[PDB]
Symmetry: C3
Amino acid sequence: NWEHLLSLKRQGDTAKRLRIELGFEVDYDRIIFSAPFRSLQDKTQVIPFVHTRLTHSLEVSVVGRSLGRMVGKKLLEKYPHLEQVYGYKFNDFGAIVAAAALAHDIGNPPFGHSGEKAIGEFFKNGYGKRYKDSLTAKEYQDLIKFEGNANGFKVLSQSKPGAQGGLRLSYATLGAFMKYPKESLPHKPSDHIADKKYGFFQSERALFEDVAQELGLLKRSTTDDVSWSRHPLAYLVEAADDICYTIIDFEDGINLGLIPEEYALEYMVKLVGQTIDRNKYNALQETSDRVSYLRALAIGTLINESVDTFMKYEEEILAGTFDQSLIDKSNYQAQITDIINLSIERIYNSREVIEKEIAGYEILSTLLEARCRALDNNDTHYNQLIQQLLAPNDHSEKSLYENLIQICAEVSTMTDGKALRNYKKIKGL
Amino acid sequence: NWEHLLSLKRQGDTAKRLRIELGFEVDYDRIIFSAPFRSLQDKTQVIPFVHTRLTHSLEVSVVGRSLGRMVGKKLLEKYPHLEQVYGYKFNDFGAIVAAAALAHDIGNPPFGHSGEKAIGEFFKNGYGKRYKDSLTAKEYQDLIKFEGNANGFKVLSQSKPGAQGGLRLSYATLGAFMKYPKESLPHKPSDHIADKKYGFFQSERALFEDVAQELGLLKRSTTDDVSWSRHPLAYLVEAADDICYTIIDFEDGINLGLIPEEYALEYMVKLVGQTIDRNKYNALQETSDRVSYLRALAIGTLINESVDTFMKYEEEILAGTFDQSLIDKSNYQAQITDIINLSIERIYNSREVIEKEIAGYEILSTLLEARCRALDNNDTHYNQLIQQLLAPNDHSEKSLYENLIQICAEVSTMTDGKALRNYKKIKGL
Amino acid sequence: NWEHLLSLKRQGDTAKRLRIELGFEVDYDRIIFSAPFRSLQDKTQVIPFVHTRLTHSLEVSVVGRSLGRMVGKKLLEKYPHLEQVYGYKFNDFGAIVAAAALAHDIGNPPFGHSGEKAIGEFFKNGYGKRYKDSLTAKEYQDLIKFEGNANGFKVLSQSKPGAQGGLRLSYATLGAFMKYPKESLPHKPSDHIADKKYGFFQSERALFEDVAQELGLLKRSTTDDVSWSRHPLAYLVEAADDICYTIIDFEDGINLGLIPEEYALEYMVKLVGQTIDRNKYNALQETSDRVSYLRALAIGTLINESVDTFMKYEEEILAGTFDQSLIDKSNYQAQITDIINLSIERIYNSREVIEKEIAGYEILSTLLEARCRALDNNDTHYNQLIQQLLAPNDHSEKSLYENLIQICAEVSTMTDGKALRNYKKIKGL
Ligand SMILES: [Mg+2]
Ligand SMILES: [Mg+2]
Ligand SMILES: [Mg+2]
């Protein structure tokens, strides 16, 4: 039911909010001005001009806003009652998808997936193994299979003294942000696209249950482990992100010298052939302009194809029977796969990227060990100094799992500069 | 008895030295030219122009020289026989107090009290725990509650081949230097000001017993753990040090931007009100000049008040019944406490000071562990290299406690530059 | 028999190669263009202009070429049949000795003998102790008493896919390169000069047995541990190396300020007195020119003396009864010993040299531990990253000893720059 999916409800609301009577734009406005989003300006994208996480978020938001606007147009033309009595507009869908896409990278720890694996391995085989017997199975699982999507949900909606609900985003935006509406256990029960990872920690189970019950998400789990169907706009958000990750990593790889210019045309002829102006392409004198020209065309065709695919399986998506992505139903699957493989071989496996990941591991391991050692023995002078350096903000009487997840969130959201400086101080440099 | 307190005896002397027949100035002259005192030029004062330990010592010596000169004037006017037959002058008292105050920071390890705690924790929970069973209780206590006052006494009077008695200072200067004339055990038996810490290690017990017996210090301990009353001039030395630590840390904090200018006048009106020239204060155009002007006034009034307090309780001080400091009997106690608390909150708890302390811990721990590992196994090539790098001076057949205390003294007296360079070499940088 | 000693056989040869029917010059040509030899341009000689390992190799090759040419002249005049029917020339001997001397430093790990001791201690008391029970006694011995001569033999003759036999040097060059033709066990069975160390690992036993059987080296071991007599030209190669190590370390020490100018003349008068032009020496205005002038004279007289000594004991050398070096039979033994001791006290025991050795230990230990930990568990993400960073070249199904010796060879042949960069990445800098 689309009426419940486009909920304007926020945390702490008592009276129901109706479309015909704050707005989805306000979510984007709040995310833009938020400190965690601003902090993305000092966070890199694990590549050797090259995009930072802030620009990637910006570009993803721009693709998601286009996808959502077109999808809202088509749904409003398919469900007249959504605008006749409920008063919804395609700009609403665009705003929801743009706000969800803008914050999709707000909780990811530095150094890419290597940082997530470092946080996981710290609690699996490192100093964090001591907490295994003091936590429940799902809590420990969250600790060992730490992902930045659950951390991003935590950042977007975590209460603090004087700020309940965090950014207080609308429930539609929160639902679109959740790509994996399931708990930390069981680990990958099936081949469904939404079961690859989890989207919320144990400290957010009640809040996401409230969000799902407000959005009317279908309960797909018959056991005691909660799991819901994906929000239909989460498909658009993820498709936008994949389109950017594919076409823009290739642009960045080509412009940085890691990928020769021939592969650009070689893997973009199929994508851009239907709309390329050959005279304009040949008239361009710089490689950067040509690759930008190709990137714009490819993004446009992929956006249109994703909109067509979404409207092809709307009923299946709303029922929860869709087990793959919108980009997986692409006619350009071979070219997309070839581009992704070439990017993996030339960028992600480059020395510079490997070197950086090896440093992240040592920095994150050191910081996590220092924070945990301070947590266990908060009486020594060195531990008091560590607490002052890394957690001067506040202190409270919380549980062990809350403290550990707070440590993980604080370490994940540090800027590369702040993390490196703290690691050097702790290492006496 | 003041005649015995103003002893001209030095180490190795056989014939008694009389005032009417080398001089207390010679102690100051020797300390100035000594290598350990010179080494203070490369040692910082754990603050982010800002005073180094050498300038702090200089300024403390200047306050102690004023206090001692006034106190000597008043005692000579109170005991005519001290000058009529013994031939003592107020310049003697000034010289003794100045020499004691100049060397009050000569044995402190770097990074402030954090370095002392690092040396203590190395032998308490670190690699140094292995020596607990091979040493006596007091020897191990000295190792684990290491203070820079005992190390300063060691530096001032430790024999070397060709140099017996070290700087060979007069016994009056050594007595005035000793703020805590007691052994390492028991640990804080009472609330007496002299029982807060200890002033000499176990390798200096015989020498300080000789010094105390020459100065006629009263034995306040009836057990087998020796402890004596404070030398009366030690009160003046400590009062001078506290006055500088209070008024000059505030000046440094104000001039460094950590403390706004308003608090200067706010906490100095009471101290300087009786002697401030308002026209001169308002005519000054720079904040540094105004704060210097206030610091000079406050130091003057505190010096006069300390002299008055010392002459108020002279008999009690000479009997050993005084359990507090001269600054503790101040009418400006509230303002002094407020200034100290503001300095603690704004300087000592600043990031930059915390960061520095966290680095000291790692550097001192690394250096101590390397030295100890070289000491236990002096056969490996790496350990021979470590011994050459850190202890090339000499080697001898000494006991385990002597070797450990020598390691602690050598690490404590390294310059920040030398310590950092050695730590980087050991860390392969 | 000199005919078999001057073998032109190379790895993989089936038909016998005769002198009268590729050439010993080709070995020098190949070594010059080889990547391992080129890599010596970025490797230092553990001294604070100062020689790198490449220039030391160059200079040693030049001394060995002179020694071999004179020795070949004298042998051809002593054995006419070597040139009458076999067709050998003195240039052959010169080429063999020069090629052997040029590669004498091609397998030495950085940081001098400190690096060799670090590799040994890693497997003796470090993380490498776990492999003791999984290897044979001699294999583990090779691991713990690792020397750069065996590694240099490995570099010169190790097969790779597409390159069998490595540089494919002539067997005479390989025999002259081998200073210690014996296995890793027993460790120093006697006082013979060839029994001080070993010259090949266990992975090269068959190849060196083939080389020795082709060269007709005398089997000096009656047990199951193979050991052969030294090749006669190995004496010349080692003598050349010692002459350079003695006279040129002194030149470098004098020119670097670690050795005053007086000792130059003081320890060179005896060596250069018979051929020095006093007018030329006094006319020189720079210390560098005078020391160069003295170095050239000393090298010349030592070369002539070494040739005379070699021809004095030719029969004893060819029978294998010579237990010392050519330089040990020198009339300038006292002056050579004095120069070596002065160099040890002033250069090798300098701070800068000690500091560098302390850093090597930490870098090599860190790199070896990382490589071994990657080897044991090649499933973790961090270990895969380490394998990509340090061993991206290739992978194969080899034994544990082969993998460990490959790790040791790869670490030993890294350039100081590459090693330091990898150590910093692993240390997160
Ligand atoms: Mg993305
Ligand atoms: Mg002081
Ligand atoms: Mg050599």
